[PDB]
Amino acid sequence: KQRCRAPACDHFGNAKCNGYCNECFQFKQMY
Amino acid sequence: MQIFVKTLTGKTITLEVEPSDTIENVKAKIQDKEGIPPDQQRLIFAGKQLEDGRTLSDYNIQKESTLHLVLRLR
Ligand SMILES: [K+]
Ligand SMILES: [Zn+2]
């Protein structure tokens, strides 16, 4: 259970999203 | 003055600002440079979420301070 890779994001990351959380992974694609 | 904003990917951008700039103004600058709608921006400084109607000066944000940008849907 690890926190998201994104600075100051306190969601949990997941493996499918490369250690980002789902929300940040979605924005990472958008940007 | 100039401040730094560290983003999702760990990329850091520079912004040219004034102490009297509001957080709203800062998000408008990030929208300009990055294309991100201000309503999806959350700016964090010293562990606290920053409110749109307040100024950088209000939050004791000085030249070369680094803010963290977190993106959130709705
Ligand atoms: K984090
Ligand atoms: Zn995240």
UniProtKB/Swiss-Prot annotation, chain A:
> Transmembrane residues, as ranges?
none
Q: Which residues bind Zn(2+) 7?
A: C4, C9, C21, C24
Q: What is the effect of changing C24A?
A: Impairs polyubiquitin binding, abolishes inhibition of IKK activation
Q: Where are the zinc fingers (A20-type)?
A: 1-31
Task: Note the superkingdom of the native organism.
Answer: Eukaryota
- Name used for this protein in its record: A20p37
Q: Specify the species.
A: Homo sapiens (Human)
Q: What is the lineage of its organism?
A: Eukaryota, Metazoa, Chordata, Craniata, Vertebrata
From Swiss-Prot, chain B:
What's the reported outcome of changing R42E?
Impairs ubiquitination by CRL2(KLHDC3) E3 ligase complex. Impairs ubiquitination by CRL2(KLHDC3) E3 ligase complex
Effect seen on changing I44D: Impairs ubiquitination by CRL2(KLHDC3) E3 ligase complex. Impairs ubiquitination by CRL2(KLHDC3) E3 ligase complex
List residues of cross-link (Glycyl lysine isopeptide (Lys-Gly) (interchain with G-Cter in ubiquitin)).
Answer: K6, K11, K27, K29, K33, K48, K63
Annotated phenotype, changing R72G: No effect on ADP-ribosylation
Annotated consequence of substituting R72K: No effect on ADP-ribosylation
Give all residue intervals belonging to the Ubiquitin-like domain: 1-74
Q: Where in the sequence is Phosphoserine found?
A: S65
Q: Where in the cell is it found?
A: Cytoplasm; Nucleus; Mitochondrion outer membrane
Impact upon substituting K48R: No effect on HLTF-mediated polyubiquitination of PCNA. Impairs ubiquitination by CRL2(KLHDC3) E3 ligase complex
Q: According to its record, how does it sit in the membrane?
A: Peripheral membrane protein
The consequence of S65D is: Phosphomimetic mutant that binds and activates PRKN
In what way is this protein post-translationally modified? Phosphorylated at Ser-65 by PINK1 during mitophagy. Phosphorylated ubiquitin specifically binds and activates parkin (PRKN), triggering mitophagy. Phosphorylation does not affect E1-mediated E2 charging of ubiquitin but affects discharging of E2 enzymes to form polyubiquitin chains. It also affects deubiquitination by deubiquitinase enzymes such as USP30.
Describe the effect of S65E: Phosphomimetic mutant that binds and activates PRKN
Altering R74K: what's the impact?
No effect on ADP-ribosylation
Marked site (Essential for function) residue numbers: H68
- Name of the featured protein: Ubiquitin
Organism expressing this protein natively: Homo sapiens (Human)
Q: What is the lineage of its organism?
A: Eukaryota, Metazoa, Chordata, Craniata, Vertebrata
